[PDB]
């Protein structure tokens, strides 16, 4: 049912979580300490009035992984509660691994995306190595224990993305989506090598988007048209996944293409260092414009832009930090409504 | 292009040749049967300044008709007649359809044949029936089309054979209401390795709902599955020259609601009575008959007249940038299906 070997546990919180679980269950404590011998880990022996002693060993493997042995002692039917609690304290995406190859990249197109992704909070990047053929960069997180390995074989133009799809991976691919072709975009969103979105009749997806956009359609940028049609192709060809929450990336990256742009046309450009923060405040959930901007603008436009930026950034935070298809399509329909409202 | 082994309407070969020749302002040398044991038509024609163009037209034993312009002293001239006769052929005569649909029995196949025979120039017969295999023929009197329907009742297999023409189109249009996803796929795209079985049905559901709006939840469930599958086919459709059959869901949906609403407004459309007894045709747009404009609101009258105009026109054009055209038609049909619900 579950294997308790080699887990991705935030180690400095392990003992604290175990203790909080025990205190929640109104249990008793026998002993909590390091493990005997030279094997690094945590021995936790706990019980409650009426049963026997449940023993749980926690091996710190050399790999940073953390193995659990609840199958030790006199009560495993009881230690399994702690084992499963700690196992479920893991953010689920930590269990999947990603490793893929994208064709047609060069250092000059990769360093801008790395800088754009490093514009984030607890996400920064370094260059790990560089020889004649391949230059490899790292991305690191401070909240999670997440690292992401970006590799460039410059001799063949290959970009090799390795790691675990978490906060870092999501930020990197979101900044990357604007450059991907159809098949590359599909590959990053569904995390698979044999995609299916290249076979949708793109004219029917175009009809779909045009039907939803109406007057706002012909005013669209060509990059936005190709991106949204491609994302709709993916949504229509998406294989059965556990969490489709990433399939909203076409819409979101489209919003910044319309949001920043039109906003920069109203005397308030959003640069990378200046960011969004200098124009908005957060009272409660919906973001607001600063008062110094409610004077030159029509109230309709202020309502539109405030709802748009309220949706955005919130969705980035809900996606980058941590019947699903129905949820995804509701989200995407709201995003299309916002994109249309921004033009009219 | 290959001018060998063609399907030429025999009763028009000589006349089409003569009118083509007089169109090109040529002269006639001879037009007659062929000498020797090959039955056919030898046509020798020319114009002032060149030599005699000879064209042989071999009547095969199978009814097929081969043209040999690669004969005589003037072939650069006979190729004009070869191309004229070659292009007087309706294109679907060169393609053949032959497919298997699983899960059928005589009691569920005979209704579709009867409903298709309710048409004007479309009739069908029982070819044979044994223990294992039952075979029907579908014949046209306006065209010269036959479609062979076979039912292996022992495995529930239905074998459709022939040429996708008037008969095939009427048959599959009546059949679409009963087909699963893969069967509907097979008849609309006329291929065995389809692509519509891999579409995310929830996104097609979102598309249909987006176009229908208030009229969406009022829709019958079978119509829902039909339209979702038709949109699935439209979205996964391999590259075809003519997608005009992918509009069969929408059309079959309109006929499904039109008859419905009419039957709900005191005028049932039966199979023997048909649609003809309920509408009149002044000029191009159909109208409802006057005996029905009194109990109904004029809005409803205009809506229903546009709907039946749409159905009859599209069926008539089907029974006798294409993706953009098809999607425009489907948008019109969706607008009509929505308007029907008021």
Curated annotation (Swiss-Prot), chain B:
Traits of the deletion mutant: Not essential, slightly smaller colonies on minimal agar plates at 30 degrees Celsius. Strongly reduces RNase LS activity, restores growth of an enterobacteria phage T4 dmd mutant. Altered mRNA half-life for some cellular transcripts, including an increased half-life for an internal fragment of 23S rRNA. Allele rnlA2 is due to a premature stop codon at residue 33. Sensitive to high concentrations of NaCl, sensitivity is eliminated in a crp or cyaA deletion mutant. Increased levels of Crp and thus increased levels of cAMP.
- Which residues span the membrane? none
Q: What triggers expression?
A: Repressed by IscR. rnlA-rnlB forms an operon, the downstream rnlB also has its own promoter.
Give any single GO term for biological process.
regulation of DNA-templated transcription
Question: GO cellular-component terms in the record?
Answer: cytoplasm; toxin-antitoxin complex
For this protein, the record's Pfam families field holds: RnlA-toxin_DBD, RnlA_toxin, RnlA_toxin_N
Entry keyword annotation includes Amino-acid biosynthesis: no
Q: Where in the cell is it found?
A: Cytoplasm
Record text about domains: Composed of 3 domains, the NTD (N-terminal domain, residues 1-90), NRD (N-repeated domain, residues 91-197) and DBD (Dmd-binding domain, residues 198-357). The DBD is responsible for dimerization, growth inhibition upon overexpression and recognition of T4 antitoxin Dmd (via residues 327-357) and antitoxin RnlB and subcellular location.
Per the entry, what this protein does is: Toxic component of a type II toxin-antitoxin (TA) system. A stable (half-life 27.6 minutes) endoribonuclease that in the absence of cognate antitoxin RnlB causes generalized RNA degradation. Degrades late enterobacteria phage T4 mRNAs, protecting the host against T4 reproduction. Activity is inhibited by cognate antitoxin RnlB and by enterobacteria phage T4 protein Dmd. Targets cyaA mRNA.
Tell me what this protein is called: mRNA endoribonuclease toxin LS
Which species? Escherichia coli (strain K12)
């Amino acid at each position: 049912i579950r294997s308790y070997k080699n887990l991705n546990l935030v180690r400095a919180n392990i003992e604290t979580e175990s203790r909080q679980f025990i205190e929640n269950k109104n249990y008793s404590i026998q002993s909590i300490g390091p493990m005997p011998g030279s094997r690094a880990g945590l021995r936790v022996v706990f019980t409650r009035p009426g049963v026997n002693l449940a023993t749980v060993d926690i091996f710190y493997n050399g790999d940073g992984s953390t193995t659990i042995q609840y199958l030790t002692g006199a009560n495993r039917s009881l230690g399994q509660e702690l084992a499963d609690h700690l196992f479920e304290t893991i953010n689920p995406a930590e269990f999947e691994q990603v490793n893929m190859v994208l064709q047609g990249f060069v250092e000059t197109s990769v360093l801008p995306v790395l800088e754009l992704s490093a514009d984030e909070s607890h996400i920064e990047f370094r260059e790990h190595s560089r020889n004649a053929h391949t230059v490899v960069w790292k991305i690191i997180s401070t909240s999670y224990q997440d690292e992401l390995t970006v590799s460039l074989h410059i001799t063949t133009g290959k970009l090799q993305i390795q790691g675990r799809p978490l906060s870092c991976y999501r930020v990197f691919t979101f900044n990357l989506a604007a450059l991907l072709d159809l098949q590359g975009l599909e590959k990053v969103l569904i995390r698979q090598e044999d995609g299916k979105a290249n076979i949708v009749q793109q004219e029917v997806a175009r009809t779909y988007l045009q039907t939803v956009m109406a007057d706002a359609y012909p005013h669209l940028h060509v990059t936005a048209e190709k991106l949204l049609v491609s994302g709709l192709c993916v949504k229509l060809a998406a294989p059965d996944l556990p969490d489709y929450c990433m399939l909203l990336y076409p819409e979101l990256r489209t919003i910044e293409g319309v949001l920043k742009s039109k906003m920069s046309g109203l005397g308030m450009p959003v640069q990378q260092p200046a960011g969004f923060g200098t124009y908005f405040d957060k009272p409660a959930a919906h973001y607001i414009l600063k008062p110094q901007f409610a004077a030159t603008l029509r109230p309709e436009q202020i309502n539109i832009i405030s709802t748009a930026y309220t949706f955005f950034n919130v969705e980035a935070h809900s996606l980058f930090h941590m019947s699903d298809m129905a949820r995804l399509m509701g989200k995407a329909t709201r995003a299309w409504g916002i994109i249309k409202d921004l033009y009219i």
